[PDB]
Design an enzyme around this catalytic site. Sequence first.
Site, PDB file in Angstrom:
ATOM      1  N   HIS A  44      50.938  36.149  44.717  1.00  0.00           N
ATOM      2  CA  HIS A  44      49.900  36.132  43.662  1.00  0.00           C
ATOM      3  C   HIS A  44      49.753  37.471  42.940  1.00  0.00           C
ATOM      4  CE1 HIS A  44      46.783  37.889  46.402  1.00  0.00           C
ATOM      5  NE2 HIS A  44      47.296  37.079  47.306  1.00  0.00           N
ATOM      6  N   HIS A  75      46.125  42.686  38.105  1.00  0.00           N
ATOM      7  CA  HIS A  75      45.993  41.356  37.519  1.00  0.00           C
ATOM      8  C   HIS A  75      46.436  41.471  36.058  1.00  0.00           C
ATOM      9  CE1 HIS A  75      43.497  40.061  40.975  1.00  0.00           C
ATOM     10  NE2 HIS A  75      43.220  41.357  40.953  1.00  0.00           N
TER      11      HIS A  75
HETATM   12  N1  LIG Z   1      41.383  41.379  43.718  1.00  0.00           N
HETATM   13  S1  LIG Z   1      40.560  42.031  44.889  1.00  0.00           S
HETATM   14  O1  LIG Z   1      39.069  41.714  44.830  1.00  0.00           O
HETATM   15  O2  LIG Z   1      40.790  43.543  44.856  1.00  0.00           O
HETATM   16  C1  LIG Z   1      41.473  41.218  46.379  1.00  0.00           C
HETATM   17  C2  LIG Z   1      42.536  42.065  47.034  1.00  0.00           C
HETATM   18  C3  LIG Z   1      43.097  41.476  48.324  1.00  0.00           C
HETATM   19  B1  LIG Z   1      43.756  42.543  49.425  1.00  0.00           B
HETATM   20  B2  LIG Z   1      44.936  41.638  50.375  1.00  0.00           B
HETATM   21  B3  LIG Z   1      44.030  40.345  51.163  1.00  0.00           B
HETATM   22  B4  LIG Z   1      43.291  41.911  51.015  1.00  0.00           B
HETATM   23  B5  LIG Z   1      42.296  40.455  50.737  1.00  0.00           B
HETATM   24  B6  LIG Z   1      43.315  39.267  49.960  1.00  0.00           B
HETATM   25  B7  LIG Z   1      44.951  39.984  49.670  1.00  0.00           B
HETATM   26  B8  LIG Z   1      44.832  41.365  48.625  1.00  0.00           B
HETATM   27  B9  LIG Z   1      43.885  39.899  48.343  1.00  0.00           B
HETATM   28  C4  LIG Z   1      42.285  40.246  49.054  1.00  0.00           C
HETATM   29  B10 LIG Z   1      42.134  41.853  49.729  1.00  0.00           B
HETATM   30 ZN   LIG Z   2      42.368  42.468  42.437  1.00  0.00          ZN
END
Ligand SMILES: [N]S(=O)(=O)[C][C]C1234B567B89%10B%11%12%13B85%14B%1158B%12%11%15B%139%12B%1061B%12%112C5%153B%14874
Ligand SMILES: [Zn+2]
EC number: 4.2.1.1
Length: 258
Positions: free
Chosen positions: A62, A94
Amino acid sequence: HHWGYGKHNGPEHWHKDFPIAKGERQSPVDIDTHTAKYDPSLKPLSVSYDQATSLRILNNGHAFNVEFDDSQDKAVLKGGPLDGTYRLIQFHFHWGSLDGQGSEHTVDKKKYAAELHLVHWNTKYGDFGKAVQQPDGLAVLGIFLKVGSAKPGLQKVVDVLDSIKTKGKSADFTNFDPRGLLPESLDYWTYPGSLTTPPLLECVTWIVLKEPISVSSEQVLKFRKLNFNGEGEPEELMVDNWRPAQPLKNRQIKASFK
Ligand SMILES: [N]S(=O)(=O)[C][C]C1234B567B89%10B%11%12%13B85%14B%1158B%12%11%15B%139%12B%1061B%12%112C5%153B%14874
Ligand SMILES: [Zn+2]
């Protein structure tokens, strides 16, 4: 049938697996610049990335994540609206299919071409996985991208993307300096919110910089060559991986600047 950004699995579907999607402190939001109040009690933001140690870059299906070694207090965010010390774990972006969209936060409904998220966790909770369970667990620094002149500090990232085209691919990615992605000014808006992807956890103090960085059309075009799909699957270009603005509800956006 996992979450993503298409017709059948995109943001308007996420609430079925993640009912917190319709919660009280969801992100992103529109930043109404005339309603955001200047708050003279806010501190300057302290971005200390001198000793940041990047490790790897990953296509997770993603976005792409540049991951840092967060086993010591090296790259930290503090000050601003924050109490205590938040450690850099990763950054990602994004972006859109076209330059007129791509950002998650908007500014008086203006959409930028992209948005950079530098994700940090509160060291009082010991690790990332514990921090996401706490209302003050994460601090995400949001930086808008507009298309114009190239950002030289981004080029090393752009040039590795052909090696991680598809979902699950990674590449070691050392000695990348995230100071090269920052604008001049650290003037910001801040508000309490959430992760903008599943699991959508309401654990984020958002710090969104007012000043966008400029990247070149060629740079953002290379983001658009990535793939959501895995190797040897039908090609779906990685574009429009942004969640639209969510209801502000009972929240105040505060500005660090007059
Ligand atoms: N777009 S945001 O709000 O910065 C989400 C970032 C993530 B980092 B990794 B898992 B850890 B969790 B999931 B994966 B990346 B997405 C959310 B956080
Ligand atoms: Zn993000």
